[PDB]
Amino acid sequence: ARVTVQDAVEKIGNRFDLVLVAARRARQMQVGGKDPLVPEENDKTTVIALREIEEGLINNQILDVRERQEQQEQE
Amino acid sequence: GDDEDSHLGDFIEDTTLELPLDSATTESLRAATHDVLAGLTAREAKVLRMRFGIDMNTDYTLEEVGKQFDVTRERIRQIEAKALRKLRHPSRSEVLRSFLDD
Amino acid sequence: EFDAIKIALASPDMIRSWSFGEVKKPETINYRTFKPERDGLFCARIFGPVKDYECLCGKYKRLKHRGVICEKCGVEVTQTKVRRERMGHIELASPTAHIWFLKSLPSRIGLLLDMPLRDIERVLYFESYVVIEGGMTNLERQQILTEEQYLDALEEFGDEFDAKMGAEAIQALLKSMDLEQECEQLREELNETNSETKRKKLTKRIKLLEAFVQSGNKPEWMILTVLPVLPPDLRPLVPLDGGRFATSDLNDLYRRVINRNNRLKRLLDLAAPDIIVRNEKRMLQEAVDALLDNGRRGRAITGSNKRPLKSLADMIKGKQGRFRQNLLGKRVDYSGRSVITVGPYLRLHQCGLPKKMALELFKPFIYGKLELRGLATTIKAAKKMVEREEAVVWDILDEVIREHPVLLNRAPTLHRLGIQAFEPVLIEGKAIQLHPLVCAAYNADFDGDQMAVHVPLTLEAQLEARALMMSTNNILSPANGEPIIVPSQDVVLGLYYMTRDCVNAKGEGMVLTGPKEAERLYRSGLASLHARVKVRITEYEKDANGELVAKTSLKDTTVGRAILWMIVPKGLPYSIVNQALGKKAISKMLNTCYRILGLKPTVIFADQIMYTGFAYAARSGASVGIDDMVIPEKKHEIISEAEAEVAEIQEQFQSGLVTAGERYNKVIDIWAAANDRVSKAMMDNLQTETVINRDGQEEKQVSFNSIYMMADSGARGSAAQIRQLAGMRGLMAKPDGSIIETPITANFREGLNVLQYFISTHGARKGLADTALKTANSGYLTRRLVDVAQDLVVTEDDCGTHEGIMMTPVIEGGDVKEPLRDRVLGRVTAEDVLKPGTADILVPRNTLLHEQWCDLLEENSVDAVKVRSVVSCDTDFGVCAHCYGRDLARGHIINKGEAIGVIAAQSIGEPGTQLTMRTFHISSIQVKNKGSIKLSNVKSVVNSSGKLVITSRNTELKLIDEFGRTKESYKVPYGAVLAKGDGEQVAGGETVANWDPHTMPVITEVSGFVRFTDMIDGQTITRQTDELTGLSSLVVLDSAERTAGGKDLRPALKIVDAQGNDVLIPGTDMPAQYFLPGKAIVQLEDGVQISSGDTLARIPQKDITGGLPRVADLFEARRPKEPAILAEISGIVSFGKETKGKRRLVITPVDGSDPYEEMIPKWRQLNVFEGERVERGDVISDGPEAPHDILRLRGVHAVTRYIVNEVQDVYRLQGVKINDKHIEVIVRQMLRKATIVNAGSSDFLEGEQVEYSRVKIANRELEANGKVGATYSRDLLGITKASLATESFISAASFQETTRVLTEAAVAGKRDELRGLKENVIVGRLIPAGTGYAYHQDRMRRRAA
Amino acid sequence: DIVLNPLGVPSRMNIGQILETHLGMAAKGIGDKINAMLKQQQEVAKLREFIQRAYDLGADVRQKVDLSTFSDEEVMRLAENLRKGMPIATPVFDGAKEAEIKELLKLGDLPTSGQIRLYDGRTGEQFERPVTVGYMYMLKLNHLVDDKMHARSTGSYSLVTQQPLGGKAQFGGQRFGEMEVWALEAYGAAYTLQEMLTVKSDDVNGRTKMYKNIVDGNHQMEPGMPESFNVLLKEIRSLGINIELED
Amino acid sequence: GQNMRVAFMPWNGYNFEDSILVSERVVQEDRFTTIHIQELACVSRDTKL
Amino acid sequence: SDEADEAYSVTEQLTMTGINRIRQKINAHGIPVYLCEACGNPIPEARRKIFPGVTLCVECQAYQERQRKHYA
Ligand SMILES: [Mg+2]
Ligand SMILES: [Zn+2]
Ligand SMILES: [Zn+2]
Ligand SMILES: [Zn+2]
């Protein structure tokens, strides 16, 4: 589990931007199709997306550019 | 005679609503029947979706199914009986039958 | 989906377009076969089918007929939900006024036509007639006639004149009336005429006309020509057990309207006798008004069972209505409730959730996970498995539960820490195990309390329990940064027993090589928990740039403090654990752990502290016995002395030396002194009594009394409660404050006989009954402050202003009560603050003053810091992120999207629960320390005597040492005889000034002869004979008893030279004469000298409220009854006509409107002279200051400082702490209203009260233009009136009078753009405050693309 | 048998409970001696002697009892019913004074201080600072947890205001009142609030649609508009007020 | 009630605010078991069908 | 905590403020008058010795006490 989200806050600043960015990524993984960027420790999607935000490899700009890349290659 | 200043209109339950376990026990059935019908020729699948109301408008009688298939009603009855026989055995019946708690 | 909620009247064509069919018969259903009768109040033809996809007869039942309208009974085959949205309409054969628009007070019908209310209701019920454009003969438009007047009118004026009666006449009146024509006539009457209040009401009517034109409403829609009936499934008639149906009263009311309407149709088509027809029309009107709002015109009808039938208006309004009780708070699925127990083994983020309570809350997730893992074929097999509790369901449930938080919520959620998210732990039992540390947050003990559990279902909702509402993220209270993870009662006593010392215990004085060896010594049984000892401990310090420089040394500590040191995280010092560790010290240790090491180390420290406290409290075996309440053996002789003094007083009363009340007071004083004596004796026997031997004779230390340990550690107890157990119970009190004189001289250890016990039950039951209300009316202040201050949200990172508050310590009386580090901590400064010699650019403008900058501030001893406040923020419809500062709890800086308004209300209202529910009342300066003199309003003269005297009025003197900080503040009177004067740095043991309340001096400017000019005795002065000194005195009096010949004339004392010339006042050419009002005795003679401010005229001769009512009243912004009038304008003062209750007080400015004058209530003690130049924003008579006064005079920061200081006074009186950000937010909502002084280029009315933000933005964008803005004047309202004015009529109908709000909205045709927290919740959308704030911003960007 | 917090005595000033712990320890100590005498059978003489000692045992009291008017088998019914401890009367403001308690303790073989040394059950070590241990009369109120505990996910719903009703006493969910709405507006929990007042309470389509999504492994909702607001619209519109939703 | 042998002492937090730490001999010996007599009822009314 | 545990603080505030106002009603300082401020008679040595700083004779005190008893 994850006791504190203090580290994930600094990566994104706002505590509400963090929730909205992590719910987005965790729903990408949940429904669906996308995979975690981090070795999942038998976690749920919520703490997985939080832990990925902790490591700086998930955020609004990264998720949006990942949107754009697949929007391109969907064609 | 309660604590919240409650009224008699708050305890009148609802006997027409279908419980969301009973709507998710109907969509599961729709998916199961679409699967078990997919395991079948277009003859049986089309004639069963048409004879019954499955994924379609008004279920037609035998003559309408025949006019759609250009065949007489008794052939339609034989085909549907054939398909139901095929569905009655396990490997086509285990999944549908679990929807029967009887 | 949908943008704002539009509102207006309803055209009869619009009401006919809503309906799906007329309702002609008053039939509900058949009595044998319960199918809808017709064409009646329940009809399948209008209101859809009564069964799903099924015609009424039965001819059409298959889904294939979906949508068909059956040929037989015309029942459209469709869903039975359709029976819950279709509306009908009753066609009133006669018109019928809308009671909302005839009793709205003002009557909208009435004030539109400008026909007064009784005239309207007299034409309504056919009491009279009203002409309607009665031709070119005799009459007015709205001229009401009596019956016979109309009869004789029809004779002499046959036609070319038409006067109607009843609601038909009002309909014709509103119809024929043209709004723009009358609006023009109102323009002419408003600008061609000047009669102030008449034009106020005139312009109100004018604004109403312009609103009725701006909207699409037509005035003739206020008369119901067509009545729509609610869909049946909202007014249902349901079968109960036994066949006895159950109906909502709306069926009764619709039936009574329909019968009367049909009977009116009948009588109309019979040519009936028109008096009977009048009665039918009147009864139908009354029925329609009972239907629309019962009990609004007459008496509620009736009901059938002797109780007032509720109507549609009752369905909306009321505490038990629809806007409130199922619209704002409703029942909720996925939720349970259970008795909470403790379970101290939990980590701070998790809580035990019963297996049986968890298998019901997660049944959807469990069904999904079963059907997913293939353990069950389908949802039905899954349901059966869960229903029989198969062996695998507990693994499936442990997997569902794992990262899924649940919301735990106690009943009175006073503050937001009452709904906290925990991670569940599937526990065996039926009781939630709640972590001990959280119970201070919940305010919850385990005497049977219960809690509700909810499951945050969706992804975005179950990352908010993880990121916002989780138990570990919330360790600081939002009302003040202090951590609310305080260990409470077993933990502070475990830690007190651990970290203490004994004079000689096992293994005293043995050097230890670290905490590990101390623990191994204790566990081995070779050294006690408190044995003084030396241990080599290595502590770290991260004052380096993130690096922890270590340091090891032989501390002289005990084994307890040693063992406790292993628990502390890295970067804390050893002095944090090397005292005896009470409760205060125990939570200060946590506050330092936070303020050094952030959140995660503190979160681990919390449960480590808790586990080790419980462990060593259990190790201590600290029980309590009846021998632990050692009563002092000096109690008996003290009580004998007290009874002796009381007998002495009884004899002195029987002797005739004191009244009865005086004997009562002296007896109570004796018994109170004796009680304090006995309590001090018992405490001196308790605290130190442990006497031990160290290498010989003896020694006393802090006692190990179990009860004393509880009292001293802070776990439980005080001196008062231990005193009642050991000393005496002292004097009881009757409920109304009447202190009983027979004191309970016993404690509970020894007995209490019958009489003392019965005496004590009085105050006992009073206290019990008082907390039976304070629980019932629990959160009424938070409710009232979440109404006024709800929709504030931090919506901008910076407004970029330069305005703030000059925050300083509250240095009142002696030493400060609240330093600068308390009140400037967490707020961003308004301006770069330099050192006193300025020395540098010390603190930049927009730096958040966290702990480091407060260190910087009180190294340099900075005394005043300007810090940005939220009442000055230049944001629009919100508050900048910087004009709110640092947010507590989370403790970094408020991020835009914080709902700071709800938080401010909850932080003023949860602490307020700890306050008293009742409102209760309560020569030479003994200056304290060494320091320098500080003058405010420096105008002093040194007499010939050498001492100083204040020739000014409000000279304030401060003792300010060499620190730069102010250390003492004092208000000096008008010219006290100051032993020390100006700037004179002196030390303690030296009084700063002598004075006398029998001595208010009228000291002059220069020395000289006091001639008497403008003085003739018998008209203004009084003959005070010097029987005390042997002279004559002519004392100054007013016109109270002297006649009016020279009554207004003032006795002038001309201070002149020895030659006779008028010595001027140095500074102004008006000579040094004084006009004296009364209360100043004159002991001079005519032609007599005085020194440099000698004694010319000498004037002879702390209660604070504290109840929570003293906060509801502080915020409600009312007017006191002794309101200290202030100085409205600068310049000089004149006194005029007297003896009226308003003596003229003229204020001649320097260069302004010189004839300015006001009134003075001459019952008051006027405390300012007439020659002194009045200063604007200054007091004249002395008494309590009014808030509106300060707001108009000194500025918004003046009113905010006053309100903040008063609320902080009442909060610090009880020791309850709350930050000032919250009260500044409540104030910022309080003074939200501007007023238009000058219309200017602006486009508001002349004296119109407008939203200050509106005028702000308008005149600001004009200031960007070339046109002069409007000169506003800021108002100041009470919370229950600052909430009354709200933009959105949804929220306003929520917490106000609903009928008034909806009537105003209907006439005005307001459009409610849902942009408030309280409106969106009602319409089911995201509140535009927190997580949904980005969503609402994206919505505002989509709109106006 | 039971372990009670010491700290509830000083704050909640009820010394009666610890006084009764002491007097109950005394009364069971006078019963333990009788039980030992009754199992290592002595005879009715010495048993009668000890009971007569324990029965006088005080200051001037109106409980004059003498075990000589008692048939020898009338002293063994008594000696059996005092086996589990002797009762002790104590009229309300006329009770046993603390000296009487200490004397009755000394008549048994308990410590006069009313306090015993006790060892940890787990570590077997001795608690420092001896503890109060005595027989206290404990009642079981019928605030039983088997009635307080309930929970609900999806059950019945009311007919007019389609909200969770329940009726299993009580299968209805919890009342998410107004103070809780303010508590969730205090956090920025907009999604929690929204689902707490539309999908879990009122919206009739969103809830059956989300019960499918929960089972389908998809945790995401389409909230819609609460039937409370639909009803309020219908009622306002059923006045003369045209209230509509601008698109 | 029942006269139980109570010891006034903390014991590891399991009686924190006002909890009670009850041994297992108290539930073994059945000296707080209670008997509770509910009454359910099935009424066969006369519906229209 | 329990309803008997904040009721204590209520009763405590109540008796505390009551005793406070009553023992403030007493006078402890000294300003020896030697003559009443209502009837002018010398406040005797006994009465002025019991209450230092007494300001009224016995009977004037009784009169004013009664008058204030009616709250007028
Ligand atoms: Mg409680
Ligand atoms: Zn039909
Ligand atoms: Zn700002
Ligand atoms: Zn006198």
UniProtKB/Swiss-Prot annotation, chain A:
Keywords: DNA-directed RNA polymerase, Nucleotidyltransferase, Transcription, Transferase. The keyword Oxidoreductase does not apply. GO terms for molecular function: DNA binding; DNA-directed RNA polymerase activity. It catalyses: RNA(n) + a ribonucleoside 5'-triphosphate = RNA(n+1) + diphosphate. One of its GO terms (cellular component) is DNA-directed RNA polymerase complex. Its EC number is 2.7.7.6. It is an enzyme of class 2 (transferase). GO terms for biological process: DNA-templated transcription. Signal peptide: none annotated. It comes from the Bacteria. Belongs to the RNA polymerase subunit omega family. The RNAP catalytic core consists of 2 alpha, 1 beta, 1 beta' and 1 omega subunit. When a sigma factor is associated with the core the holoenzyme is formed, which can initiate transcription. Promotes RNA polymerase assembly. Latches the N- and C-terminal regions of the beta' subunit thereby facilitating its interaction with the beta and alpha subunits. This is DNA-directed RNA polymerase subunit omega. It comes from Escherichia coli O157:H7.
From Swiss-Prot, chain C:
DNA-dependent RNA polymerase (RNAP) catalyzes the transcription of DNA into RNA using the four ribonucleoside triphosphates as substrates. Resistance to the antibiotics salinamide A, salinamide B, rifampicin, streptolydigin, CBR703, myxopyronin, and lipiarmycin can result from mutations in this protein. The keyword Lipid biosynthesis does not apply. Changing residue 743 to S/T: Resistant to antibiotics salinamide A and B. GO terms for molecular function: DNA binding; DNA-directed RNA polymerase activity; magnesium ion binding; zinc ion binding. The gene is rpoC. Keywords: Acetylation, Antibiotic resistance, DNA-directed RNA polymerase, Magnesium, Metal-binding, Nucleotidyltransferase, Transcription, Transferase, Zinc. It is an enzyme of class 2 (transferase). HAMAP family: RNApol_bact_RpoC (MF_01322). SUPFAM superfamilies: beta and beta-prime subunits of DNA dependent RNA-polymerase. Binds 1 Mg(2+) ion per subunit. This is DNA-directed RNA polymerase subunit beta'. Its EC number is 2.7.7.6. Zn(2+) 2 binds at residues 799, 873, 880, 883. Changing residue 760 to A: Resistant to antibiotics salinamide A and B. One of its GO terms (cellular component) is cytosol. The RNAP catalytic core consists of 2 alpha, 1 beta, 1 beta' and 1 omega subunit. When a sigma factor is associated with the core the holoenzyme is formed, which can initiate transcription. The rRNA transcription and antitermination complex (rrnTAC) consists of RNAP, NusA, NusB, NusE (rpsJ), NusG, SubB, ribosomal protein S4, DNA and precursor rRNA; S4 is more flexible than other subunits. Mg(2+) binds at residues 445, 447, 449. NCBIfam families: rpoC_TIGR.
Curated annotation (Swiss-Prot), chain D:
It comes from Escherichia coli O157:H7. This is DNA-directed RNA polymerase subunit beta. DNA-dependent RNA polymerase catalyzes the transcription of DNA into RNA using the four ribonucleoside triphosphates as substrates. Coiled coil: none annotated. Belongs to the RNA polymerase beta chain family. The RNAP catalytic core consists of 2 alpha, 1 beta, 1 beta' and 1 omega subunit. When a sigma factor is associated with the core the holoenzyme is formed, which can initiate transcription. The gene is rpoB. The modification N6-acetyllysine is found at residue 106. It comes from the Bacteria.
UniProtKB/Swiss-Prot annotation, chain F:
It holds the Pfam family zf-dskA_traR. The keyword Metal-binding applies. InterPro entries: Znf_C4-type_bac (IPR020460), Znf_C4_TraR (IPR012783), Znf_DskA_TraR (IPR000962), Znf_DskA_TraR_CS (IPR020458). A zinc finger (dksA C4-type) spans 36-60. SUPFAM superfamilies: Glucocorticoid receptor-like (DNA-binding domain) (SSF57716). One of its GO terms (molecular function) is zinc ion binding. It comes from the Bacteria. NCBIfam families: C4_traR_proteo (TIGR02419), PRK13715.1 (NF010268). PANTHER family: DNAK SUPPRESSOR PROTEIN, FELS-2 PROPHAGE PROTEIN. This is Protein TraR. The gene is traR.
